[PDB]
Amino acid sequence: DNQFYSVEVGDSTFTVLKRYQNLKPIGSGAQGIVCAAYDAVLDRNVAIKKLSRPFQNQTHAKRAYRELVLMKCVNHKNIISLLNVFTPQKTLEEFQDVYLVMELMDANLCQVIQMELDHERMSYLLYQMLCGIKHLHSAGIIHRDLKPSNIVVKSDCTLKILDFGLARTASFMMTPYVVTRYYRAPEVILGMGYKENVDIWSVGCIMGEMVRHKILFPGRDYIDQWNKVIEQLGTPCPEFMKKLQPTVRNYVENRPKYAGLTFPKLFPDSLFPADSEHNKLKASQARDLLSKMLVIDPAKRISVDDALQHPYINVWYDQLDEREHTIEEWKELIYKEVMN
Numbered sequence: 001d002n003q004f005y006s007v008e009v010g011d012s013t014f015t016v017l018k019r020y021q022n023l024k025p026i027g028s029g030a031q032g033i034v035c036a037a038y039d040a041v042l043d044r045n046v047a048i049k050k051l052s053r054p055f056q057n058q059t060h061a062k063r064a065y066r067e068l069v070l071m072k073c074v075n076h077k078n079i080i081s082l083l084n085v086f087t088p089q090k091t092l093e094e095f096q097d098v099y100l101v102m103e104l105m106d107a108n109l110c111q112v113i114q115m116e117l118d119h120e121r122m123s124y125l126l127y128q129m130l131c132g133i134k135h136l137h138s139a140g141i142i143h144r145d146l147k148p149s150n151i152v153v154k155s156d157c158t159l160k161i162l163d164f165g166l167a168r169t170a171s172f173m174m175t176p177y178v179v180t181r182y183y184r185a186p187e188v189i190l191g192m193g194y195k196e197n198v199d200i201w202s203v204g205c206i207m208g209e210m211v212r213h214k215i216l217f218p219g220r221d222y223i224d225q226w227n228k229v230i231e232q233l234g235t236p237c238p239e240f241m242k243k244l245q246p247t248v249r250n251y252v253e254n255r256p257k258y259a260g261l262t263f264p265k266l267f268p269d270s271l272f273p274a275d276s277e278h279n280k281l282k283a284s285q286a287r288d289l290l291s292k293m294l295v296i297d298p299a300k301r302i303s304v305d306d307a308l309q310h311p312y313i314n315v316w317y318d319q320l321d322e323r324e325h326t327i328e329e330w331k332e333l334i335y336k337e338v339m340n
């Protein structure tokens with residue numbers, strides 16, 4: 001009779017359509033819990049994400065609403081695709097949970113970073129990240145929080161980005177969970193305003209970490225993080241700092257100065273495959289792209305288009321809503337998106 005059934009998966013209770021069999025947990029971010037499952041109707045494996053009471057506050061609601069709207073209308077091979085969406089609840093009054101069904105991938109980028117990776121696979125992963133970012137920028141979406149945990153890959157080295165980043169507004173939370181700030185651009189760190197190549201910084205951080213196998217710019221807060229940035233890349237020029245609001249100008253200009261490191265010193269020959277002439281050249285090219293992505297001043301940083309054109313990468317070449325609402329308003333907005 002009923003077209004749903006329920007099973008326990010850790011703390012949570014997954015109540016899912018009967019087509020979805022043999023649920024297995026595979027991770028848990030901020031918005032919810034995620035299971036792998038077999039889709040008996042499609043004869044394929046899927047990932048199912050549970051959003052619990054997403055309308056419970058502004059922060060969750062805006063994120064859920066945005067993700068649902070964007071995942072449905074954005075169509076690209078390097079952006080995770082929405083296969084199905086449902087709630088087991090029958091009315092707006094009873095409505096609680098939303099379940100998103102997506103293609104099932106094999107790993108996080110975190111896991112891939114830890115591996116020794118050849119240039120063929122590093123450049124291919126980067127290419128795909130850039131193509132995806134490009135797509136988002138063309139659709140009016142500047143991500144600003146690209147990070148390895150929200151990028152997934154398959155064994156065949158296919159790459160998809162999982163989320164659409166920050167809201168243009170931006171907040172307060174209760175759930176004890178730490179946000180990963182390590183990949184954010186200087187302009188996000190310092191609060192400057194940004195353009196599309198804000199996301200290049202993040203790709204630079206990811207690329208660099210693939211080579212060094214350590215997070216480039218860690219720290220408890222933006223204070224420590226900014227210190228790690230300037231210790232490595234050196235203090236930026238005056239031209240840059242003229243672009244900063246008065247109070248953040250004063251902070252940045254009064255921190256201990258550093259000359260920084262050359263990119264050969266930041267990413268030495270040691271870290272690269274460089275045994276054949278092929279690899280010698282690809283290493284050279286790799287460090288050159290890195291040097292162009294990890295630059296503090298966005299005015300001097302490489303664009304997405306110039307990056308896709310770069311020799312390391314080009315071998316692979318081939319409505320609006322952002323407003324405030326109460327709980328009950330959000331709950332209905334999300335419910336009707338779910339019952340399209």
Ligand SMILES: CC(C)NC(=O)N[C@H]1CC[C@H](Nc2ncc3ccc(=O)n(C4CCCC4)c3n2)CC1
Pocket residue numbers: 026027028029034047049080102103104105106107108149152162
């Ligand atoms: C032990 C070893 C075999 N694997 C492991 O440790 N982690 C894998 C296990 C399989 C995971 N696949 C996958 N596919 C689609 C999605 C879609 C949305 C989403 O939010 N996620 C989360 C990101 C990572 C956590 C879940 C998705 N995850 C990747 C991570």
